[PDB]
Symmetry: C2
Subunit: 336 residues, 2 copies
């Protein structure tokens, strides 16, 4: 899997740029910053821009990493106890800006209106009260792998994860599809509309309000999918090198479809066995193609003392206007 | 409709940039040019970048124009007789490169393998071979991977022949009609008409579809009246369609792209039409260049022969 290792000169240049922009703009609340993002991203080292452009256009490998960034630990400060109530932007604004620049080289940053106050860059660090069950703000318990929001027609196209700190080198898991491990028979079944993919609870329209025609319409397409339960494929794009959408937990293989069950079981085994540990250590930025890779998290014991692992996360869409029906305005980048 | 007028300084910077790139790269057949496009486009004047970005993100206007480019008429040379068989790139390469730069600020340039020999930049000039009815449409309205934007660069336009552009005024339509238009009740048929891999026709015709989509309060549209039909029994969908056509037809505007203007059309918010005009056929005729822009190249992968190709079909 190709990666890019920054020279110390490149790391210094990236660091300087992010400090300059952090001083020049107030916050991501600034509409002008969001406008300026792709032009600003053109100020990144040329080798870096070339590398990500190649990754994007090759449409072959499902993840890549850019390693060796300089993330100033003294400036960044202690890992917070919670995301709620923090001053925004924080002293790690330069790192958030970096990830937004990278998102602009790949597409458009976007978010989910109900998640982390609508912030475009999410925090990933342990929160003591969240210690019980499977999520990003946890630690103690496993996070099995999946395509992000597999059921959703406007799911992320890419995900960008930047490791601000990771003292105990807790890796992330990512897995791709080795198509040669699957029979042509199984591939054809996986390309057919034979599977049901259920939404995560956070997407269910009965989660939110029932007032006004405007918001009802914002969830009408998802409601329709819940009501009609359309069957869909797990593989798509090119038969020779396919995209996938695989969330085992939310996937139903219809009981009577014996061929869909055989093929699904073969697909699951291939992806499960191909899972890899990718460490995103301090200064590493991991890029995940949500159409070619699944991702997961490993459990770890947190210290809750301001020294814990801290990642930042940005979701990327190749086509912001596609999701217009689920966005409250044309300008907003938040769905819901 | 917002527009941007280049200073002479900006016009000179753009001209110089396009000449430089034309010498640095061999053709659009060069994969490294296609890679470098977004980074190269960031070398355009910052006011121009900001303006197009604002248009893209505003998602409000159906078109915009950047005016006052310096298109060297001597270098561009005479308007050709035809596109077919013509050696590419020609002397007007710098102007084609400009539109490609613009396309990279908006999205990705793409084309149709069966249109103008699969060239990424199309030619629009009078061709000798030819009661002219006046029509308008969304580009490739039937197609799920149709253009998101269109870019028309006017290399020359001596008689100031306009293009028609029409947007949707909602206030004229009932909430009832809008709801029906949002529903999949309409048929839109395809336009005009290598050996491998799985011959030609792959992901073909299937279901009924809507004409309006996106926000219920400020909808996008796909409207090609000539190729649009409604099942006879569906009287509501027929009524709503008639009303939509009337609104769009009545609001049609003439937009002139004169020499040095680049017109940008949002294929989701605007329909466009061409206007008949008398040509001279003497090498001095109106000459536009056209590039098609997709917001999401990967979405069309199933209709593209390889991962690298930007040609559908
Ligand atoms: Fe996830
Ligand atoms: Fe057209």
């Amino acid at each position: 899997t190709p990666s890019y290792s920054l020279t110390p000169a490149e790391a210094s240049a990236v660091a300087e740029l992010t400090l300059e922009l952090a001083a020049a703009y107030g916050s991501f609340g600034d509409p002008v910053l969001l406008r300026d993002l792709p032009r600003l991203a053109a100020r990144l080292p040329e080798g870096v821009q070339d590398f990500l452009r190649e990754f994007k256009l090759a449409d072959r490998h499902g993840h890549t990493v850019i390693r060796g960034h300089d993330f100033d630990q003294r400036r960044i400060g202690p890992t917070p106890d919670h995301w709620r109530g923090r001053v925004r932007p924080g002293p790690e604004f330069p790192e958030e800006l970096l990830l937004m620049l990278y998102s602009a080289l790949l597409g458009e940053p976007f978010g989910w209106a109900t998640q982390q106050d609508g912030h475009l860059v999410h925090d990933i660090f342990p929160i003591r009260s969240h210690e019980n069950d499977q999520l990003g703000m946890g630690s103690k318990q496993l996070l099995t792998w999946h395509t992000e929001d597999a059921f959703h027609p406007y799911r992320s196209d890419y995900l960008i994860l930047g490791a601000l700190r990771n003292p105990d080198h807790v890796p992330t898991t990512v897995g791709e599809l080795d198509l040669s491990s699957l029979s042509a028979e199984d591939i054809d079944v996986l390309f057919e509309p034979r599977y049901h993919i259920a939404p995560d609870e956070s997407h269910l329209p009965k989660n939110n309000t029932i007032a006004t025609e405007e918001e009802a319409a914002r969830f009408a397409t998802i409601q329709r999918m819940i009501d009609e339960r359309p069957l869909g494929p797990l593989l798509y794009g090119s038969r020779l090198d396919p995209y996938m959408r695989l969330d085992p937990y939310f996937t139903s293989v219809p009981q009577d479809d014996t061929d869909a069950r055989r093929a699904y079981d073969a697909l699951f085994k291939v992806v499960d066995s191909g899972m890899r540990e990718v460490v995103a250590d301090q200064g590493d930025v991991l890029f995940i193609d949500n159409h070619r890779a699944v991702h997961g998290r490993l459990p770890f014991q947190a210290r809750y003392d301001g020294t814990d692992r801290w990642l930042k996360r940005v979701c990327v869409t190749s086509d912001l206007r596609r999701s217009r029906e689920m966005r409250a305005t044309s300008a907003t980048r938040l769905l819901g």
